[PDB]
Amino acid sequence: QALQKYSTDLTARAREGKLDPVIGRDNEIRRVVQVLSRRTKNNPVLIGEPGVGKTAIVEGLAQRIVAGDVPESLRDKTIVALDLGSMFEERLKAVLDDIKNSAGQIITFIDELHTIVNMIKPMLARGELRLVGATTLDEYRKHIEKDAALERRFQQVYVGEPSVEDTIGILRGLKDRYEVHHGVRITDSALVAAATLSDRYITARFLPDKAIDLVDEAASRLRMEIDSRPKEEVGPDDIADVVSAWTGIPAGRLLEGETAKLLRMEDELGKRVIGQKAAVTAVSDAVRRSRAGVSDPNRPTGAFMFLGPTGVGKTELAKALADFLFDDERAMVRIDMSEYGEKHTVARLIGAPPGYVGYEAGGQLTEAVRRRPYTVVLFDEIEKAHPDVFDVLLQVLDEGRLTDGHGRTVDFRNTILILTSNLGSGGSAEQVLAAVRATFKPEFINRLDDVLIFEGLNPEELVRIVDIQLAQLGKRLAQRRLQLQVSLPAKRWLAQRGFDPVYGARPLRRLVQQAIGDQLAKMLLAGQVHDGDTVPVNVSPDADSL
Amino acid sequence: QALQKYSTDLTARAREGKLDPVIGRDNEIRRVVQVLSRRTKNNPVLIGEPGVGKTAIVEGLAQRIVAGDVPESLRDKTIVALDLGSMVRGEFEERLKAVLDDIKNSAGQIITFIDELHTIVGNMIKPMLARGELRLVGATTLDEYRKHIEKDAALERRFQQVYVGEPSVEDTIGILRGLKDRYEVHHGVRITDSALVAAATLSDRYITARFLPDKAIDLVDEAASRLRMEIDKEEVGPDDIADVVSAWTGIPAGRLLEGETAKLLRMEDELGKRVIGQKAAVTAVSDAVRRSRAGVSDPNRPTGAFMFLGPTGVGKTELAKALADFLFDDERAMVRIDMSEYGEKHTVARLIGAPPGYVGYEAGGQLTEAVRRRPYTVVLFDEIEKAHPDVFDVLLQVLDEGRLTDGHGRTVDFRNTILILTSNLGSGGSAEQVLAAVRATFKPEFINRLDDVLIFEGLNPEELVRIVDIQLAQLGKRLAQRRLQLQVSLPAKRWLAQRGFDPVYGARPLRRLVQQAIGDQLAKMLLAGQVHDGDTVPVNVSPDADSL
Amino acid sequence: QALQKYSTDLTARAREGKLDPVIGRDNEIRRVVQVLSRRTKNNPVLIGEPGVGKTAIVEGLAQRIVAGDVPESLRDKTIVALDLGSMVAGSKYRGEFEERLKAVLDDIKNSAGQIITFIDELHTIVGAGADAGNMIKPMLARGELRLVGATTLDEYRKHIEKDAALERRFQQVYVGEPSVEDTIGILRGLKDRYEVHHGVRITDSALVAAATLSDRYITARFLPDKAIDLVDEAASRLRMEIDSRPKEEVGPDDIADVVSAWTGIPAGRLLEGETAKLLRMEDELGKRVIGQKAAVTAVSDAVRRSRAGVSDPNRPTGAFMFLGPTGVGKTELAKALADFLFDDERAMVRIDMSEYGEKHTVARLIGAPPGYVGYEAGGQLTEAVRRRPYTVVLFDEIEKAHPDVFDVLLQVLDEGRLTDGHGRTVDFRNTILILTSNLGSGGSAEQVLAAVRATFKPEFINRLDDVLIFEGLNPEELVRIVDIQLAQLGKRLAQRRLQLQVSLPAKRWLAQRGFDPVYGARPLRRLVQQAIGDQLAKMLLAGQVHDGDTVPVNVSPDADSL
Ligand SMILES: Nc1ncnc2c1ncn2[C@@H]1O[C@H](COP(=O)(O)OP(=O)(O)OP(O)(O)=S)[C@@H](O)[C@H]1O
Ligand SMILES: Nc1ncnc2c1ncn2[C@@H]1O[C@H](COP(=O)(O)OP(=O)(O)OP(O)(O)=S)[C@@H](O)[C@H]1O
Ligand SMILES: Nc1ncnc2c1ncn2[C@@H]1O[C@H](COP(=O)(O)OP(=O)(O)OP(O)(O)=S)[C@@H](O)[C@H]1O
Ligand SMILES: Nc1ncnc2c1ncn2[C@@H]1O[C@H](COP(=O)(O)OP(=O)(O)OP(O)(O)=S)[C@@H](O)[C@H]1O
Ligand SMILES: Nc1ncnc2c1ncn2[C@@H]1O[C@H](COP(=O)(O)OP(=O)(O)O)[C@@H](O)[C@H]1O
Ligand SMILES: Nc1ncnc2c1ncn2[C@@H]1O[C@H](COP(=O)(O)OP(=O)(O)O)[C@@H](O)[C@H]1O
């Protein structure tokens, strides 16, 4: 009776009727009471993530106890809690004396007992206090997993997060508490919008609490825009607005200007990547079948690998892909699989486990994808890595998460995966087909999307490349204001001279440099071509004079 | 008695009987009390898997003590337990000093007991131990003990191992039927020997993660608690436990019954639910697998060594994928190893990997390292005709004695696997020259040890509708995220046949050919509009191609 | 009060008589004394493989000091048993172990030079750092403390010789293991302690037999304790047999009982029943091999000699190579032998020499040198033989491996020696090597005894024992062969309750078809299968046959039928 202050009550609140809204999970409450009425491995704990409603689980348990659906050994059982805000070791003895001397009738519920585990171990060894708790999977696995002394008295009970149809009524039961501060109307449309939008896209928090914070920030945004400079009720708009401002991944109804660009991706990308019709069709069909919600929910929103002959665009295409989605090139995650020539370099992209020298440094991939999980990762020269990182990527595909040294889990269900190589480089189709089937096991290539092949450059395809390179050189030497004047004969001359179909486009850059920049840099330092000038070029018998 | 707050007693509470009697395992107690009665290398250590009865044996010895039956040397000597999860950076050695000093000044032979001491061992107990005043009785698991007590120990010269592997079905049944009344008063429902034996056998067979003496008690107590809660049937029975096992694993209560008759009679269209046509082949293979597990064939032979060849794209692999699915409860079990690279004399060592210290050693062989683990697979062999006439010697050794040797030195076992040697021979002959070519190309005596050599019959120009129909029934699940139903029309569905067969690789493309077309041709409607989740999406056969 | 809670008094312990009476080893005690009595750098360190008594010498020195048998400047020195496990243990702060170590050193150097110190297993002296076990190094090289130590060879080399400037202040006393006679002396000295502990008696013949067996069968540990452990084990077993059970002393065969109760070796003095089985061997082995009377006698005589006590203790128990026509029963004779003296057909180590046609494939039964891929795994054969040191090695058809693998057996034989990757050695001294072949193939004994000579070498044929030649299958005895096969089949038909009623003409046609002169009885098991097992399988799953029916067979004009 001397515990009423250091610990609150759930028997008085039961009768006095005030209780947070509880719905569903009745099978879970039945499981809880069934495992409580056992002889061994009784008094379970709750496993999950922030935003399940496990306090709500035990609250519904208490409400059903006070209503009465219990077995014979549960005469209301007066379940209680032990306040962690009750924080020396002398008081705890008398605090636990009431629980011990009880008949197991004032059993307690230690909310978040993860870190409490000296004192309560022998006090539990006799089987007198239930010590029911509520923790998460990471804390179970790092705290109470290896100790065989306590895993004989704890039978975990897993819980299911997404419950959209009941989150509707949950919002119904909590909508009132937010219509008082925010003088706003969150319509049923807003309820079922918060319920059915942020689940697949904002998978960084969890539905029952991310949906509460979504409507909270939406009501705050509405009460904000109410003033002089920004609607009178939350609808299907401010919800999507808050969806956009979280973790960077855009997800709404439609931005009313993005539907056009997406229809025009193939054409828009053809001005930076040239040729590869099959490749552009396949890489375009891959993102449109995702932005619309057609793609599968447990998979990276894009994952394939291509290869072929050199100098064709295997990197330029991925770089243009990073360009057209983030508007800048630096927003791509790029790690080159060339340096991974030994086995033990797995911890370079994973981070060393607790207890070694480089411990707080974190990985190079998982740390860059944990925060801002929408960028595109480029695995340049995947063929070079030790055939053990391929086993990590095996887990990555078709599962969508990986663990690093510290024991946390990050998600990969909204990113794009690009891998490249040049296997064979001389086989037309069957040699390279058998080679890619033989170098990576058929159980890893099974999961992938289409493995693409680039075809190579041709004469008609090189004049446009020359035009692109010349426009680029203009952009470069525009800051000394020496805009170019080049003739179509010289254009075709370059496009013809640099053509050899074994190296691709790199000889064209080499020829452009050695042919123009040579003479241009020779003149620009001897004077007479000073700033604000336009130089012409003309095909000389062998060279091209200026 | 000064710091007895991290220590529990075993004889005091034995003077009350709050322990469980441990009938059975009376050899181990005699072995332990014999070891503990020596002069050097005393204080044994119990080595065995988890939840095997390690704590049960020491408690049984404690109870035999409190009764009094051992030699009077060990008589009148108590035991004290310890919990290490209460001690644990630092001050663990300080409390270790406290407890060791307590034991030391106790000035007697008060035996200790330290569970899973592989976390304790270090150099702080050996000067205490090589003097003869304390007696510690520890316990751990086999591989763990091999880790912490062999490399950094140098102490193994003063520890004696004791082995407790696992009880058997008949023994855990006696254990259960001994430990029944306690629960018949805890809950109190009723108990049946049928339920006990069913729990024992079903746990042993299907709960392949935990072990017997605690695994059985767990299931029994769970079923009893569920049937006490159900009163929200005053007995537990075999079904009353099979339901729990089904809820646990996922496999329903039906298949969790007799596994010979009701299984070998399911060799029916349950295969034909995944394969289409080829009922003759399915019947032949079913008879071969039925008669093979009868119990009269030699105990050293693959469970089947048949092969099937002919036209591709007819579902040659699909038969095997469905076969492994039905038998081993998984279709991700077959392992395909192409006989293409094996066209060179030297490369036959690729599927084994001969020497330790050469290029391919750690990777093992392609065949063995994928068989010694998961010895339930269904190995496939593409284009068996192109493999050099030296791997056939390996195959002979396989299907003449159910074992093989890798390079590491291990022995892989083949007495419960299934071989399947696909091919592509027989391009011109119907049934007359295909067998002659198979006889002439391969060694005509190697084929003798094989089973039926059936050839897959071609697909009826009508019987492509069934395969494409299973395909459509499948792809109907694809757009279940927006509940957009699909249309069917015999002109459209049969339009897939004559334009997707391409009779050099059967229906290889018949998945992509239709999926890309329909999916990516409707994928723009799925963003613009024109459909909602009740629309048949009527697709028609336009004058030339398949528009909507 | 400094070295009062971090140390005991070994001298006072010996004064209280609670130590064991060291016997012998006066050379090493004299060396330790004439080192400990030096002027500067007086610190001996007892070095030697583990188990040979590296501490016993220190207890001996303590006893000698207590008794007063030491030179003038060594009386009343009270050697101290220092320890560091209880100094570095409780300390979680900056500079706290240093205050304790300095207090101990100060308490030593305040008193006169009469606190001779003793740290056991001093390979635990280089740690404690984080400048520890290193401040203690000026005092060492000045003769302030004496610091008698004791460390194993391996730990010494691994932990100290990496710290050369510290190893200089030490002196090594190589404590080699004793021989059998000294071991008998020590055992006879210690007999009374165990005779008092266990209320039994121990015979001198038992002590001698222990000291002799513990040297010939347990070749992984060392003598002065490897022997004592057996005496203790047998005393304890006899005690347990006396108690708890409603001619009370250990004997010289209980020790053999122990040393056979582990390691599997049947070493003993032919207890009863065993002799009956050995005398009844040629016939008992005949029930599984019919014919070859010449060979069974040889192997039987080998086993008889080896277990009767007349055989060279350092050479294998036999190295037979028998060869002959195809399908005569060579591998089957070997398997029947292994089944005889083990009753476990899968407890022998057969290796198929048909695989080693390549040169480099020998590495599987040796290992790999240090610095290569598979090194810590070992060798297959060596690993299989290091445990179970009683198997029956076999070499299936050793004619394929090209003549280089013949240069490992060349010294496996005649010594029972083999050295794997790690540099270890294993003993084949109590195995039966057996290697078949197929030279000849029809030729007479003087046309195959030329094949052996022209294939192998003199250095090889000289190693192995008699080269048994196998006769051809007598056309008569195949009836008994078919009898054996039908018995094995009936044994396979035991989960059900079926029997057979095999008729004499059926058995005759069976022995008549499937014994072609070039391949012997090999095409008989497959014929039995395809003519009985499959016929019954088609006849059991489809009714018309049920368990219990004494199924008869017939001799129908066509292939055999029911
Ligand atoms: N289709 C193309 N469109 C635009 N630029 C291209 C194209 N093909 C090649 N290039 C240019 O040629 C060079 C090749 O770029 P990359 O894509 O990095 O080379 P690659 O095709 O990936 O071959 P490797 O294996 O990486 S050397 C770059 O300077 C590109 O700008
Ligand atoms: N022979 C036996 N007699 C009575 N009870 C037994 C017997 N064997 C097992 N048990 C019971 O089965 C349970 C086994 O659990 P433990 O004793 O913890 O197992 P263990 O041998 O300590 O190995 P771990 O640590 O559990 S993997 C005990 O609670 C016993 O009551
Ligand atoms: N000369 C001896 N006289 C009497 N007993 C001996 C003698 N040599 C060895 N022993 C006994 O043989 C055993 C050897 O044990 P120890 O010498 O203490 O072990 P150790 O020599 O320190 O080897 P390590 O490195 O500690 S495992 C003890 O039981 C000794 O009593
Ligand atoms: N005297 C015999 N007693 C029993 N079985 C025999 C006898 N002679 C031959 N056999 C049988 O003949 C068959 C072949 O015997 P194996 O010894 O295995 O052949 P093999 O001696 O190894 O000949 P190769 O050269 O290796 S093919 C087995 O089924 C034996 O049971
Ligand atoms: N099913 C539900 N319906 C309505 N409100 C709920 C429900 N579950 C929880 N709540 C309320 O929302 C909050 C959720 O937070 P909390 O339960 O602490 O999350 P967690 O379970 O991760 O600890 C609680 O304070 C509770 O009052
Ligand atoms: N009899 C069949 N039953 C079901 N699907 C079949 C059948 N024959 C072919 N298929 C289809 O063809 C696809 C590929 O055929 P597959 O067997 O992989 O090619 P191959 O026979 O050349 O190895 C299967 O995934 C399946 O969709």
Which residue ranges have their beta carbon within 6 Å of ligand 5? Answer: A 20-23, 50-56, 170, 173-174, 209
Q: How far is CA B382 from the centre of its chain?
A: 27
Q: Which of B218, B336, B340 sits opposite A442 (nearest CB)?
A: B336
C-alpha torsion angle, residues B476, B477, B478, B480 (rounded to 10)? 110
Contact assessment for residue B413 and residue B297, using Cβ atoms and an 8 Å cutoff:
no
Q: CB B336 to CB A125 under 8 A?
A: no
Distance CA B547, CA B538 (A): 10
Q: Which contacts of A520-529 are long-range, i.e. CB under 8 A and separated by 24 or more positions?
A: A520/A477, A520/A482, A520/A546, A524/A480, A524/A482, A529/A482
The residue to which tokens 């030593």 are assigned: C108
Contact assessment for residue B403 and residue B414, using Cβ atoms and an 8 Å cutoff:
yes
Taking the Cβ of residue B8 and every Cβ of chain A, the question of whether any pair is shorter than 8 Å is answered with: yes
Non-local (6+) Cβ contacts of B66 within 8 A are B11, B14, B15
Closest CA to A412 of A490, A301, A320: A301
**Between helices A188-196 and A207-225, what is the axis angle to 10°?**
130
Q: Which C residues 32-71 touch B at CB under 8 Å? A: 50-51
Distance CA C163, CA C122 (A): 13
Nearest chain B CA: its distance from C228 CA (Å): 9
Pairing of strands A538-539, A544-545: antiparallel
Nearest chain B CA: its distance from A56 CA (Å): 22
Non-local (6+) Cβ contacts of A528 within 8 A are none
Q: Which C residues 411-470 touch B at CB under 8 Å? A: none
Return the DSSP state at B310. S
In SS3 terms, B184-250 reads as HHHCCCCCCHHHHHHHHHHHHHHCCCCCHHHHHHHHHHHHHHHHHHCCCCCCCCCHHHHHHHHHHHC
Judged by its nearest atom, the ligand closest to the C-alpha of residue A457 is: 1
Distance CA A105, CA A76 (A): 8
Of all residues in chain B, the one with the smallest CA distance to C369 is: B357
Of all residues in chain A, the one with the smallest CA distance to B221 is: A38
What token pair was written down for B31? 């072995």
Q: Which of B115, B221, B340 sits opposite A434 (nearest CB)?
A: B340
DSSP string computed for C274-323:
HHHHHHT-HHHHHTT--S-HHHHHHHHHHHHHHHHT-S-SSS-S-EE--B
Please list every residue in chain C followed by a chain break, i.e. its C lies more than 2.5 Å from the next written N: 130, 246
What token pair was written down for B411? 């022995």
Torsion angles phi and psi, residue B404, rounded to 5:
-155, 165
Q: Which of C89, C383, C493 sits opposite B97 (nearest CB)?
A: C89
Q: CB B294 to CB C363 under 8 A?
A: no
Distance CA A469, CA B166 (A): 75
How many of the other CB atoms lie within 10 Å of CB of B365?
23
Phi-psi region of A543 (alpha: psi -120 to 50; beta: other; left: phi over 0): beta
Taking the Cβ of residue C92 and every Cβ of chain B, the question of whether any pair is shorter than 8 Å is answered with: yes
Task: Answer yes or no: is C502 a known binding residue.
Answer: no
Please give the biggest Cα pair distance in chain A.
Answer: 108
Contact assessment for residue B434 and residue B310, using Cβ atoms and an 8 Å cutoff:
yes
- Residue B9 CA: distances (Å) to CA of A314, B81, B105, B110, B494: 72, 6, 18, 11, 80
Residue C501 host element (H or E): strand C499-501
What token pair was written down for C231? 């005496």
Pairing of strands B411-413, B403-405: antiparallel
- Residue C303 CA: distances (Å) to CA of C262, C271, C317: 21, 16, 7
Contact assessment for residue A99 and residue A106, using Cβ atoms and an 8 Å cutoff:
yes
How many of the other CB atoms lie within 10 Å of CB of B113?
22
Mutant choice from C8, C20, C82, C86 vs B, greatest count of B C-beta within 10 A: C86
Number of H helices, E strands in chain A: 21, 14
Non-local (6+) Cβ contacts of B280 within 8 A are B454, B457
Distance CA A293, CA A283 (A): 17
Resolution in A for the shown PDB structure? 7.0
Contact assessment for residue C117 and residue C158, using Cβ atoms and an 8 Å cutoff:
no
Non-local (6+) Cβ contacts of C497 within 8 A are C547, C548
Q: Where are the beta strands (DSSP E) in C175-237?
A: 201-202
DSSP string computed for A423-456:
SSSS--SHHHHHHHHHHS-TTTTTTS---EE---
Non-local (6+) Cβ contacts of C132 within 8 A are C88, C97, C98, C101
Question: Roughly how many angstroms between the first and final C-alpha of chain C, as a whole number?
Answer: 98
Distance A45 CA to ligand 5 centre (A): 17
Sequence length of chain B is: 548
Return the DSSP state at C529. I
Distance CA C423, CA A323 (A): 62
Write the burial class of residue B25 (CB in 10 Å: 0-12 exposed, 13-18 middle, 19+ buried).
middle
Torsion angles phi and psi, residue C72, rounded to 5:
-60, -50
Q: Which of B85, B217, B519 sits opposite A150 (nearest CB)?
A: B85
Distance CA B48, CA B163 (A): 6
Pairing of strands A535-536, A376-380: unpaired
Return the DSSP state at C472. P
- Residue A247 CA: distances (Å) to CA of A198, A236, A250, C113: 12, 20, 9, 75
Distance A540 CA to ligand 1 centre (A): 29
Contact assessment for residue A331 and residue A375, using Cβ atoms and an 8 Å cutoff:
yes
Question: Roughly how many angstroms between the first and final C-alpha of chain B, as a whole number?
Answer: 88
Distance CA B175, CA B216 (A): 10
Residue of the nearest CA to atom 30 in ligand 2? Answer: B56
Closest CA to C300 of C328, C256, C252, C340: C340
How many of the other CB atoms lie within 10 Å of CB of B165?
11
Task: Answer yes or no: is B48 a known binding residue.
Answer: yes
Taking the Cβ of residue C471 and every Cβ of chain B, the question of whether any pair is shorter than 8 Å is answered with: no
Distance CA C259, CA C270 (A): 14
Distance B115 CA to ligand 3 centre (A): 30
Burial B119-148 (b: 16+ CB within 10 A, else e): bbbebbbbbbbeeeebbbbbbbbeeebeeb
Contact assessment for residue C234 and residue C188, using Cβ atoms and an 8 Å cutoff:
no
- Residue B52 CA: distances (Å) to CA of B141, B168, B216, C200, C305: 10, 11, 11, 36, 46
DSSP string computed for C419-452:
--TTS--EE-TT--EEE-----SS--HHHHHHHH
Lateral strand order in the sheet of B160-163: B114-115, B138-140, B44-47, B160-163
Residue of the nearest CA to atom 21 in ligand 5? Answer: A53
Contact assessment for residue A363 and residue A319, using Cβ atoms and an 8 Å cutoff:
no
Q: CB B85 to CB A147 under 8 A?
A: yes
Closest CA to A74 of A46, A39, A34: A34
Of all residues in chain C, the one with the smallest CA distance to B100 is: C86
Pairing of strands C171-174, C44-47: parallel
Mutant choice from B39, B125, B161, B286 vs C, greatest count of C C-beta within 10 A: B39
Taking the Cβ of residue B92 and every Cβ of chain C, the question of whether any pair is shorter than 8 Å is answered with: no
Cβ–ligand 2 distance for B138 under 6 Å, the answer no
Return the DSSP state at A11. S
Phi-psi region of C95 (alpha: psi -120 to 50; beta: other; left: phi over 0): left
Residue of the nearest CA to atom 26 in ligand 2? Answer: B51
What token pair was written down for B289? 């697998």
Which residue ranges have their beta carbon within 6 Å of ligand 3? Answer: B 40, 157; C 20, 22-25, 50-51, 53-56, 150, 152, 186, 190, 224-225, 228
Distance CA B396, CA B419 (A): 12
Task: Answer yes or no: is B311 a known binding residue.
Answer: yes
Instruction: List % helix, strand, coil for chain A (3-state, nearest 5).
Output: 40, 10, 50
Closest CA to B453 of B419, B429, B428, B427: B419
How many of the other CB atoms lie within 10 Å of CB of C402?
11
Q: Which residues of C touch B90 (CB under 8 A)?
A: 90-92
CA atoms within 13 A on the CB side of C139: 19
Torsion angles phi and psi, residue C210, rounded to 5:
-65, -50
Distance CA C218, CA C239 (A): 24
Kindly give the number of the ligand 1 atom that is closest to the alpha carbon of A457.
8
Non-local (6+) Cβ contacts of B90 within 8 A are C90, C91, C92
Non-local (6+) Cβ contacts of A57 within 8 A are A22, A25, A28, A29, A32, A46, A134, A159
For residue A125, give the 3-state DSSP assignment. helix
Contact assessment for residue B198 and residue B242, using Cβ atoms and an 8 Å cutoff:
yes
DSSP string computed for C65-123:
HHHT-S-GGGSS---EEE-STTTSSS--SSS-HHHHHHHHHHHHHHS-S---EEESSGG
Torsion angles phi and psi, residue B378, rounded to 5:
-130, 95
Closest CA to C253 of C277, C229, C237, C234: C234
Cα radius of gyration (chain B): 33
What token pair was written down for C76? 């009343």
Residue of the nearest CA to atom 24 in ligand 2? Answer: B51
DSSP string computed for A477-501:
TTTTT--EE--HHHHHHHHHHS--T
Task: Answer yes or no: is B304 a known binding residue.
Answer: no
Task: Determine the residue of B32, B59, B116, B175 to mutate for testing ligand 2's pocket, defined as the one with the most ligand atoms within 8 A of the Cβ atom.
Answer: B175
Q: Which residues of A touch B228 (CB under 8 A)?
A: 37, 71
Mark whether C and B touch (3+ CB pairs within 8 Å). yes
How many of the other CB atoms lie within 10 Å of CB of B86?
19
Q: CB A122 to CB B8 under 8 A?
A: yes
Which structural technique was applied?
A: cryo-EM
Distance CA A398, CA A417 (A): 12
Q: Which of B85, B186, B225 sits opposite A35 (nearest CB)?
A: B225
Q: Which C residues 72-91 touch B at CB under 8 Å? A: 81, 83-86, 89-91
Write the burial class of residue B241 (CB in 10 Å: 0-12 exposed, 13-18 middle, 19+ buried).
buried
In single-letter form, the type of residue at position B246 comes to S
Non-local (6+) Cβ contacts of A495 within 8 A are A459, A462, A463, A465, A466, A508
Q: Which residues of B touch C533 (CB under 8 A)?
A: 296-298
In SS3 terms, B397-445 reads as HHCCCCEEECCCCCEEECCCCEEECCCCCCCCCCCCCHHHHHHHHCCCC
Cα radius of gyration (chain C): 34
Taking the Cβ of residue B226 and every Cβ of chain A, the question of whether any pair is shorter than 8 Å is answered with: yes
Q: Degrees (nearest 5) of the Cα angle C25, C31, C33?
A: 105
Distance CA A75, CA A71 (A): 8
Please give the biggest Cα pair distance in chain C.
Answer: 112
